[PDB]
C-alpha cells in the first residue's frame, strides 16, 4: 500500500505515510514533508519508490524495493518521489 518516510535515520523521527502516486516537491511540501530531508524509508510488498535528488523526477535517484534505514548520498536530499504499485 503505502510507503513510509522518516526525517531521520533508522525509522526515527518525523513520518509520513504516501500511497501510490507522484510527487513534487510542492506536493510532498503540502503533506507535511520538507525539501531534502527524508532518511530512511519502510517499503511494504507490493508497492516501491523511486527517490530523486531534483523536482520534476529528475536527477541522481534511488530505487527502494524493501526497508531502508539509511539512503547514503541521498539522505536530506529528496525533492520528488513516485510511489509505484508492484501487484506481487
Ligand atoms: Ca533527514
Ligand atoms: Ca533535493
Same mark, same amino acid.
Request: aromatic residues 6%.
Given at each position: 500500500?503505502? =510507503? %513510509?518516510?522518516?526525517?531521520?535515520?533508522?525509522?526515527? +523521527?518525523?513520518?509520513?505515510?504516501?500511497?501510490?502516486?507522484?510527487? %513534487?516537491?510542492?506536493?510532498?511540501?503540502?503533506?507535511? =514533508?520538507?525539501?531534502? %530531508?527524508?532518511?530512511?524509508?519502510?517499503?511494504?510488498?507490493?508497492?516501491?519508490? =523511486?527517490?530523486?535528488?531534483?523536482?520534476?523526477?529528475? +536527477?541522481?535517484?534511488?530505487?527502494?524495493?524493501?526497508?531502508?534505514?539509511?539512503?547514503?548520498?541521498?539522505?536530506?536530499?529528496?525533492?520528488?518521489?513516485?510511489?509505484?504499485?508492484?501487484?506481487?
Amino acid at each position: 500500500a503505502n =510507503i %513510509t518516510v522518516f526525517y531521520n535515520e533508522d525509522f526515527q +523521527g518525523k513520518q509520513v505515510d504516501l500511497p501510490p502516486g507522484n510527487y %513534487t516537491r510542492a506536493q510532498l511540501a503540502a503533506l507535511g =514533508i520538507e525539501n531534502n %530531508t527524508i532518511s530512511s524509508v519502510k517499503v511494504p510488498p507490493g508497492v516501491k519508490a =523511486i527517490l530523486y535528488q531534483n523536482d520534476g523526477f529528475a +536527477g541522481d535517484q534511488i530505487e527502494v524495493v524493501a526497508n531502508a534505514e539509511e539512503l547514503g548520498p541521498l539522505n536530506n536530499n529528496v525533492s520528488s518521489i513516485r510511489v509505484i504499485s508492484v501487484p506481487v
